[PDB]
Amino acid sequence: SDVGTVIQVGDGIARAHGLDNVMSGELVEFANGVMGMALNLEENNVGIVILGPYTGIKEGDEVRRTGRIMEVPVGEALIGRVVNPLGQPVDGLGPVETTETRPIESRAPGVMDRRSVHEPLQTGIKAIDALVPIGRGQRELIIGDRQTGAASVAIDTIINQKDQNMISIYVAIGQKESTVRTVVETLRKHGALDYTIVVTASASQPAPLLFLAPYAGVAMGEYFMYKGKHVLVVYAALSKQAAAYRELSLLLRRPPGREAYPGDIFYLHSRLLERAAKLSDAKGGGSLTALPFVETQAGDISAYIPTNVISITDGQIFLQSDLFFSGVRPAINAGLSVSRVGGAAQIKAMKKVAGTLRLDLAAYRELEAFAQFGSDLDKATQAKLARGARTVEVLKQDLHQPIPVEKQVLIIYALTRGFLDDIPVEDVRRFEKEFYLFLDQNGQHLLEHIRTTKDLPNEDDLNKAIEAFKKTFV
Amino acid sequence: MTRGRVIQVMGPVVDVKFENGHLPAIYNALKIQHKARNENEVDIDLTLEVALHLGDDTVRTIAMASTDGLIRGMEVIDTGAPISVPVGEVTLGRVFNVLGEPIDLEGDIPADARRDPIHRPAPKFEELATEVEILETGIKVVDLLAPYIKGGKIGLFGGAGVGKTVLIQELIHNIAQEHGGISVFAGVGERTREGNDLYHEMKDSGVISKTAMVFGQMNEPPGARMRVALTGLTMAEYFRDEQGQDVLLFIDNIFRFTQAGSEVSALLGRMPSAVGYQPTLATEMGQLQERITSTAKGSITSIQAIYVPADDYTDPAPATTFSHLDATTNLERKLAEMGIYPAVDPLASTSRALAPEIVGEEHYQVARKVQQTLQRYKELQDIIAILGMDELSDEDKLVVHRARRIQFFLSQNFHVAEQFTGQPGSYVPVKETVRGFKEILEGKYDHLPEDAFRLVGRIEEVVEKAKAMG
Amino acid sequence: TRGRVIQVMGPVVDVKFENGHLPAIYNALKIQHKARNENEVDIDLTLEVALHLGDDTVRTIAMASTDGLIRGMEVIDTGAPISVPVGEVTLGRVFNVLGEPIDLEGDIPADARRDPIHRPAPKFEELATEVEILETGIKVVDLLAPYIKGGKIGLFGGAGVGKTVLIQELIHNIAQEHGGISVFAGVGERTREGNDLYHEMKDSGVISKTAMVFGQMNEPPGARMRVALTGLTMAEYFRDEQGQDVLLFIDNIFRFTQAGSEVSALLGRMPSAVGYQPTLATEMGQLQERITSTAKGSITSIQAIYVPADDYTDPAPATTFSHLDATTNLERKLAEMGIYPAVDPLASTSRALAPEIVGEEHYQVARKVQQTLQRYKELQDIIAILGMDELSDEDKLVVHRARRIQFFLSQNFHVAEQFTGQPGSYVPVKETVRGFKEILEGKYDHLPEDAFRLVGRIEEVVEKAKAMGV
C-alpha cells in the first residue's frame, strides 16, 4: 500500500516489494532518512534510485512513501549561496531561508508563449559579440578543447553580467569539488557571487544527483524568468549527466542503445534545453538563455552525446588548439562556428560594421595559401591579405579582460573603414589600447551616443575623432 | 465494454492489462483521464499507442507524452481505433500537435467534426495513375531544370539564410493560386523557437490560411516525434481523396523522423541493425513514402528536407530516403550573396524527371543547352579572374556575356518577396521560360545590359526594364 | 553470525546468512578452514561484501584465489570493512591490500590503531585552494607542465613510452628533498619493478619515511581493486592526524578500473560502452575525491595513467582527465625517434602555466616554444614533398630551431643509466628558461643538432659540440 520491504540493494539502487500506490517519479524514504526516487514500477517490485549513501540499507528493512514528486526550493535567498541539486547549502554560512518551491519537471513554454529573440547578451569578447552573437532566449553550445581556454569563456560571460540586470546560475556537473570551489572563489572576488547562485554535484556524489543537477538549475532559473527577470544558465558538462543516467538505466536493466545509452537519452536533453525561451509580453517578457559547455579530446565532436546536443541547440562556438598555439587567442574558429539568431541579437551599431568584418575575414582565410607568394600577387589580392592580417590582429584579446560593446563597435568601425590599414600589423594591438584611452579622454559624446541610441554616431564626427587620434599615434 | 489497468511504467513505456477477450488492436490509441483523489496524487491526461501483444492479456505501449505521476492499477480506456485527427476545411489556417488538438489559441475543433485514422494501407495498385504528369510551379529555374512530378518526392538541400522558407511559402502561394490546391506543413522534431517564428512569418503571408500545419516539437517523446508526419499525411490525403485535387506536403527533416523511429526501437528492445538503426528502417520509410502518390482523382507531392548525418551519403538514413526521391533542389549561399534569388542549383532532378518523356523533345534540348553554358562559365571562372579578364574578352566573352545573361534570367521576383522590396511578383509558364531561354541562346537579346535580365518574370519585362534604364 | 558458501565462480562468491543478520555492504568476511581429511586443503581467505540478493544471500569479491573452496564452508562476518594500521608503525614497511606486512621484518602488534578502507570524501568547506609551483628538475615539465604543490598530476601514455621511468625519476628528484612522508602504491603493474624500487629506496635511505603497498598483476581483481584504497588510508592518516605534507605515488591507477570491469559481469551488471562497467565514473570519483588537500594538510598526488592504445578517447583516460590539475602526455612518435622522456609539449595545457606565476619571464618563453613546435607539425606534411625546397628559405628558419628545441627538450635521467650509459642531470628552472631563450634568440643556430640530445644545461650542449669537433 504505502509501505514496503527491501528485497535487493547495491550499486546505488534498491528493489522494494509493496508501495502499490507509489507513482512514477515519487520521492521515497528508507528507515534511516535516506531519500530515493521511484523510477521503475514493475509487476511485483519497485526500482528505487538512492539519493544518498546506500550502505546502511539491508534486505528486509522497511521503506515508506512521501506522497510527492521531486521539488526544489526557489527564491531570492539562494542568491550568493552554494547548493546541492536539492536545495541544501554546501558553503557553510547557515541555512538559505527560501519561502517556496518549484517542481524539477515543469513543462516548457509552448509555441504561443514565445517572442522571437531580439536583444543581445554581451559576453565582452570581440570575436563572439561580432561574429557569433548570442541573444537573450538562445541556447548556444561552447565546444572547447582542453588545451585552449574553454571554461573561462563561460566564467567571463557570467562576470560581464554585472551592469546588465541579469541573474545567473552556474551548474557544475561531475566536476572535481576543489575546482568548483576555485570557481566559487573566482566569482566571489568579482562580487559576481552576489548574483550567481551556484549548483554543484561533484564526481563523488551519487549518480542520481548528477542526473538531477541541470534540471534543478533550470528550475531555479524559471522562477526568476516567470517573475520577469533575465537569467543566464551555464551547464558545465551535460555529457556527465548523460553518463550518470546511463549508469542508472543499466543498473535497472533497461535496453541499451547506441553506446549503451537508453532510448530516451535524446529526450532527456531535449526536455532540458527547451526550457530556455524568450517569453512573449503577455507572459511577462522574461527570458532564459542556456550555455552548455563541452571539452573535446582533440577536435572530435563525433561522439553520440555531442551530436545530440549540437542538433538541439541554436549554434556552437568552436575553439581549437591549433589556433591557440599559433598565437590566436581566444582561439575561436569563426568559419566553423555558427549562430542562427545572429543579426537579430546585435545592436544597430554592431550590425552596421560586422558584415564587412566577416567578409574580410572570409576572404583572408581563402587567400591564406597565396600569402607565401606575396611578391607576385596583383594589388587586389595584396590589399585583401593586408586587410586580413589586421582583422585577425584586432580580433585578439587577453583572458579576463572584457570590452564594452561601444568600444568594440568603434574599433571595428576603425578597422573596416580603412583607418587602420596604415599601421603595421605589429602596431595594431597597441593602437587599439591607446585608442581606447583616447576615447576615454575625449570621445565621451560618441560613447554616450552609442550607449543611448544603440546606433552609430555621426560619421563626420567619428572620422574626425579617428584622424585626430592618428595624429598623435606614433 | 473494455477497459484495462496500468501494470508497468518504465520511462516512456507502459504496459496495460486487459480482460481476456477484449485486447486492443496493435495500433489503437488508449486514454488515461485521472482526477487526483487525494493530495498524494496528481492529474494525468495521457495517450498511449499499442505496440505489441506480450501474452497474458497484457500489451506494451508507447506514451505520446510524459508518464510522470502514473500509478499501477490506474484505469485505461481503449478508443478502438488508431489516433484519429480532424480533416477538411477546419484544418486550414490552424496549428496542431500530433493528436490533432490545436496548439494555437484560436479555440478547439467541435466534437462532431470528422476524424480519420493516422494509420492506413497505401492505395491499391489499380488506383494509381497510369502515366507521369509535370507539376508546373511558375518558377523559371525549377520548371526548366528540375521539374516536379505529380506524386513525386523532391529533396530540398541548402544551407542557412539562403531562402528555404521563402521558396516554401512561394510554392504554397503559386500552387494555391494557379492550380487550386491546399497544402500541409509537418515539422518533425521542430525547435519550438523556430516553430513560433515560422507560424508568425506564415501568418503575415496569409498563406497561413491555406497552410493547415502540424508540429512535433523537439522536446516531445519519440512516439510523438515518429507519428507527427503520419498525422500531416492524413490531413493531406483527405483533400486528395475527397476534394479530388493536387496537394503539397512539406516535411521538415525526414532524418528526425528516422531518428525518432530508432529511439522507439531501442525503447521497445529490438536488436539494432547496421550503424545502430532500427531493423525496420526501410519498412517504416516505405510505409510513410508510399502513401504520397498520384491517383485517378488527385495527387500529393512532397518537398522533404534531408539531413546527411556526417556528410556521408552512404549512411543508411540518407540511402533509404534517396531511394524514393524523384527530384532534388539545392540552394547556394554563393548565389544568395550574388543577389540571385531563388538561389537554386538543382542538378540530379534533370536526369529522371525532365529528361525522358515530356520535356525530352522540346524543353530537354533547351535545358541541356542552359546547363552546358553554365558549366562552361564555371570552368572559365577560375581563368577569368586574372588572365581571362583580357584573354576571355574576345573569344570566351561570347560564352560569358550570354552565360551571365542566362544566370541573371534564372532569377525571379517572388510574390512573397514584395514585403522585402516593392515588386508585385510574377508567375511564368513553362512554355514561356522554354521560349525566353531559347531566344537568349540564339543571341536575340545580347545588346541589352546584363542588369536588365535580373529579378524579372517573362522575357518581355527584360525588354521593358532595359528600355526604362536606357 | 555464521554463513555458508553457496556458489563459487572465480573471484565472486555467494554466501547465505541464516538468522536475518546479513552483513552490510563493504563488510569483510573470513573463511578459515583446516582440512577435514586428505581430500581437502586448508583455507584462509577474505571476502568483501558487494551486493544483497533475496533469500538471505550476499555476493562477495574474494581478495585472494578461490581454489579449494567447497560448498558449505563456514563464513564469519567481522562486522566492519577492511581495516589497516596507521601511524608511525607503517613507516619503512611493505604491506599488502589487507594490511599484512610482506617484508620479512616482523609483524604489527594486535592492539595497534587500525583504520577502515572505505570513507566519505572531504566536504566543500574544508578544501585547500592555492597554487604553489613544484620544481622537478626536468626541463620539459618545469617549462611546459609545472606541477602544483598539493595538486593532482597525471602522466598519460600508451604501453612502453616511459611512464614508470618518469615516476622513478620524480621520486629520485623530489622524495629526498621532501620534508614529509611518502607513500607508494603499486596497482597491477610488475613485481620486478616493485622489488627494484624498494631496493633503491633502501640504498638511498628514503625508505625510513616511506610506506609501500603492493598489489601487482599476479593478484586476483579484488586485491587490485582495493590496494589503492589501502595506500590512500595510510596517507590520509598522516594528512589528518599529523598535519603533514604527503607525497602519494600511484603506479597505473588504470588497473583499478580494469579490475572493476573484470568483476562486473560476474557480479551481474550489463556492459557499458567499450565493455566497461556502468559504474565507472562513480567508482573512479569515489577514489579520486579522497585524494585531495585540506586546511589540515596536503596530499601531492602523482599518478601514472595507461592509455589503452594511445587512444585518448577511451573512457578510462577520458574520465580521469576531469580529476587532474596538471597532466603530461607521452608520445610514441618521440619515443621511436629516441627523444626521452618523450613528453608531448602541447597536451599538458601547461595548466599551472596559468599565466600569473610564470607570467612575466617564464610564460613568454613557454608560449614561444609551443608556437614554434605547433608550426613545425603543420610544416611536417608540407616539408616532405614541396616543402624542403620551398620552405628552405622562410620556414627552414622555423624548422632549424624546432629541430633543436625538440632535441634540447630531451634529457638524461639518473634512474635511466642502464638505458643511456650516462649519469643523470638535474636542471633548475632558471637555467631551463635561460637556455630556451638563447636557442630562440639564435645564439646556438651554428652548433650541430645532434649536440642538443640527452643533456642538461646548455653549457653541456656547447661542450658536446666541442667534443664532436665544432
Ligand SMILES: Nc1ncnc2c1ncn2[C@@H]1O[C@H](COP(=O)(O)OP(=O)(O)O)[C@@H](O)[C@H]1O
Ligand atoms: N525571393 C526573395 N527576394 C528577396 N529577398 C529574399 C528572397 N528570398 C529570400 N530573401 C531574403 O533572404 C532571407 C531568407 O530567409 P528564410 O527563407 O527564412 O531563410 P532560410 O533559408 O534560413 O529559411 C529573407 O528573410 C530575405 O531577407
Ligand SMILES: Nc1ncnc2c1ncn2[C@@H]1O[C@H](COP(=O)(O)OP(=O)(O)O)[C@@H](O)[C@H]1O
Ligand atoms: N628517460 C629514458 N631514457 C632512456 N630510455 C627510456 C626512458 N624512458 C623510457 N625509456 C625506455 O622505454 C622503456 C619502457 O619504459 P617504461 O618505464 O616501461 O614505460 P611504461 O611504464 O609506460 O611502459 C624502458 O625500458 C626504456 O628502455
Ligand SMILES: [Mg+2]
Ligand atoms: Mg531557414
Ligand SMILES: [Mg+2]
Ligand atoms: Mg610501466
